[PDB]
Structures are given as structure tokens and as C-alpha cells.
């Protein structure tokens, strides 16, 4: 069971209405911050989706980067058997 009142100022006993016992709320700035942070959250919803395709393609490119030195190693190691 609460009560309703306009204003007062500067108490010493705690449970008395005042100007310092008022929470300082700006509605439009909080709605603006809430809306823009909902949009940041909605962008955060759609982020960890398709780096698995990047993982498979990075496995592909490290494969084709290993196959080049796999080509180079035996060719570089056959050009040492002509010396005799």
C-alpha cells in the first residue's frame, strides 16, 4: 500500500521523500539506448554461423599449400643423384 506526493527537500531520517531520494530517469535517452542496443544484440544474433565453411576452405588451402612442397621435395631430392 503506497502513497502519492509532489515534492520535498533534504531529509535526515531516511524514509522521507526528498529531491535526493528520487531516481534520475530520462525516458527518451533510455528508450534510444535500449533500441540501439537491441539492434546491436540483433546483429550479435547472426554472427557465429558460417565460419565452418571457412574452416573447410582453410583446410583446403593448407592442403594445396602442403601439396606444393610435397611436389617440390622429391623433385629437389632427385636432383642430387646425378653427381656420381
Amino acid at each position: 500500500d503506497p502513497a502519492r506526493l509532489p515534492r520535498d527537500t533534504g531529509p535526515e531520517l531516511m524514509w522521507a521523500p526528498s529531491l535526493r531520494n528520487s531516481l534520475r530517469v530520462s525516458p527518451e535517452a533510455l528508450e534510444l539506448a535500449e533500441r540501439e542496443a537491441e539492434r546491436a544484440r540483433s546483429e550479435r544474433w547472426d554472427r557465429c554461423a558460417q565460419v565452418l565453411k571457412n574452416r573447410l576452405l582453410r583446410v583446403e588451402l593448407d592442403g594445396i599449400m602442403r601439396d606444393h612442397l610435397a611436389r617440390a621435395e622429391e623433385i629437389r631430392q632427385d636432383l642430387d643423384a646425378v653427381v656420381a
Binding site: N21, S22, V25, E34
Partner: protein
């Protein structure tokens, strides 16, 4: 080039090996502003979590590098971890430093980011300090190299130079995951059990505000905050990305030092990384009326949600609007001992 020969001769008790560092002045600006600190080494493990002994590290600020590419302070990282033979390295491995002048700010550093940069770089008598004799003759530019730092995506400068068999056995060392993983999921576990305590406290009670702190509130509070608008209490658990600056563990370490309080402050819906772990006093003659004034000023913060932790095993949540939801704190003393060993001495 003073703190390296300082800590090199110092930590011979608890460390076999000592690595020397630079720290730029941009990389720790988000750690502690206004140059308030000026350390303590505790390198935890990746999968062998447990607890380890602590080692003190000395340092200096305001003294400039021989590189003019950047101009910053002096630190150094001890390494004492590897059992028996030090030839093995632990990969993906954190090493925590507590840089301080009076314990604010932490320094997390890797063994890969350290050692990959290290390899990338390379009628009686008074006895002389032996290890300072070889640093004066080096005086060269190739001793310092730039390392992409992993925790903060910046440059961290190491210094090493071919000293002796300790640093000579370092550059040959190699060896054959979960060191940043465990602390965060441990924070989310204690946050979920605290949010579950709040859930069951709101369930066993009538789902009602007792309003422990007195504020006057307007009649449109059910309008400018919508109905059941606990979306901040919803995403509270993602927002606590820090813990040892957060007040939640600060009450547990404060058990070793009765009427004390620590307050975390998170904004109403993403105004920014507000603050973590402030102090509410009762000891000095400012008194309980000053505690009450700071507490009602806490409660009238209309755009910040506050979380209150007590020392005696109790948790509290402060809704902006003076509403308070009670809660418990009771955690298993294994995590308690793990936390107080993670900071310091039991």
C-alpha cells in the same frame, strides 16, 4: 635496463628461468587509467589447473626504451613451470602477472606469445654481480622485437640477448587447449548458481519488491520501464565478462580482512563498461549515515543495475527503483580456495 638485472638475481629461489620484457604505454591504458600502478607472478595451467606457488617481480615506469619506435615501461616474466627438465613447453598457456604499486589491474600473457618472440629475437674480497656484466656490451637493436599480443591485439616488446646457458637452452626449446577457457566458464557457473538463487528466492517469496533501500519513484515507472522489464537482469550474465575486478569474488577474498559491502555497477541497457567492485565503508568515522547516503545514491542511479555481495555469505541485487531481491552466496570451498590462491595467499 635495470629491472631485468633486478629480478634476475632475485627470483632464483622459486624460479629456475627468468624472461625479461617491455610493456608499451598504450597496451595497459585500458587496464588502469591515469598511470595509477607502478608485481606478482602466478602462472596457472591449461589442463593441470590446480594451484601453484607465487613469485614476486620488480619493475619500473617512466624510463624509456632504446627503441624510439615506442616509449614505455619495464616488466619481466618469470618462467618456472616445466617439471624437472625445462625442455618441454606448455602450449596455449596463460601466465598471470599482478602489476601494482598499492593490486589493481591484471596481466595475462601467453607462452607462445613469449617464446615465439624470444626465438624470433635470437684481506678478503667482494664478489661482483655476475649477470649485469654482459648486458652493457650488447646494446643492440636486434635484441628487441615486436610481438603481436594475443589478449589485447597490440605490440608487446620483449628483450633478450645471448646471455648464458639459461637463456641458451631457451632458444632450442619446443614441445608437442583450455587456459583462457576455464576462468570464464567458471565465472558463468557461479553467475548461474547466483541467478538460480535469485530465481528460487523470487519463487519462494511472493514475486514482490521489499524495497530495502528507500527511493521515491514516479507513477509512470510501470511505463518508462515496461511490464516485467527484466531484460537487464536477463543479459546480466553475458555482461559480466570480468570477475576479479567484479565485486562478486571481492567479498570472498575480503573474508580474511564484518559490516563491509562491495558493489558492482552495470548500466540499464548497454551504456558501457561502467565499473566493477567499488567500496562501501563502515570503519572510519564517516559512519553508517555516510554508508546510508552512498547507498541511497547507489539506489537512485536510475540507469545502472547494481549487484551487492556481503562477506558473511549473502548476495543482493539492486533494481534501479530501489527494489531489492535477496539471495544466497553459499559456494563450495574448493572454488573459494581456488579464488584466494588465484589472487594471493590463503
Amino acid at each position: 635496463m635495470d629491472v631485468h638485472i633486478d629480478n634476475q638475481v632475485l627470483s632464483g629461489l622459486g624460479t629456475p628461468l627468468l624472461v625479461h620484457l617491455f610493456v608499451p604505454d598504450t597496451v595497459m591504458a585500458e587496464l588502469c587509467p591515469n598511470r595509477v600502478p607502478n608485481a606478482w607472478c602466478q602462472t596457472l595451467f591449461s589442463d593441470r589447473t590446480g594451484l601453484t606457488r607465487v613469485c614476486r617481480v620488480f619493475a619500473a615506469r617512466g624510463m624509456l626504451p632504446g627503441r624510439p619506435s615506442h616509449r614505455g615501461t619495464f616488466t619481466s616474466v618469470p618462467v618456472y613451470c616445466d617439471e624437472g627438465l625445462p625442455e618441454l613447453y606448455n602450449p596455449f598457456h596463460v601466465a598471470a602477472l599482478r602489476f601494482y604499486d598499492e593490486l589493481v589491474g591484471e596481466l595475462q600473457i601467453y607462452y607462445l606469445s613469449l617464446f615465439e618472440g624470444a626465438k624470433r629475437a635470437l684481506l678478503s674480497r667482494v664478489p661482483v654481480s655476475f649477470s649485469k656484466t654482459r648486458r652493457a656490451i650488447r646494446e643492440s637493436r636486434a635484441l628487441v622485437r615486436g610481438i603481436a599480443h594475443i589478449f589485447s591485439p597490440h605490440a608487446l616488446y620483449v628483450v633478450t640477448y645471448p646471455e648464458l646457458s639459461a637463456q641458451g637452452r631457451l632458444h632450442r626449446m619446443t614441445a608437442v587447449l583450455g587456459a583462457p577457457e576455464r576462468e570464464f566458464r567458471f565465472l558463468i557457473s557461479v553467475a548461474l548458481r547466483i541467478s538460480a538463487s535469485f530465481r528460487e528466492k523470487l519463487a519462494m517469496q511472493a514475486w514482490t519488491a521489499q524495497q530495502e533501500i528507500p527511493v521515491v519513484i514516479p507513477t509512470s515507472y510501470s511505463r518508462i520501464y515496461k511490464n516485467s522489464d527484466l531484460i537487464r537482469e536477463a543479459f546480466f550474465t553475458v555482461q559480466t565478462r570480468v570477475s576479479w575486478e567484479s565485486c562478486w569474488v571481492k567479498a570472498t577474498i575480503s573474508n580474511a580482512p564484518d559490516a563491509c559491502l562491495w558493489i558492482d555497477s552495470h548500466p540499464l541497457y548497454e551504456e558501457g563498461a561502467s565499473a566493477w567492485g567499488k567500496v562501501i565503508d563502515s570503519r572510519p568515522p564517516g559512519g553508517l549515515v555516510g554508508a546510508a547516503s552512498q547507498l541511497v545514491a547507489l539506489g537512485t542511479d536510475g540507469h545502472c543495475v547494481h549487484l551487492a555481495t556481503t562477506s558473511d555469505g549473502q548476495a543482493f541485487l539492486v533494481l534501479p527503483g530501489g527494489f531489492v531481491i535477496k539471495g544466497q552466496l553459499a559456494l563450495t570451498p574448493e572454488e573459494r580456495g581456488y579464488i584466494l590462491a588465484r589472487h594471493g595467499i590463503r
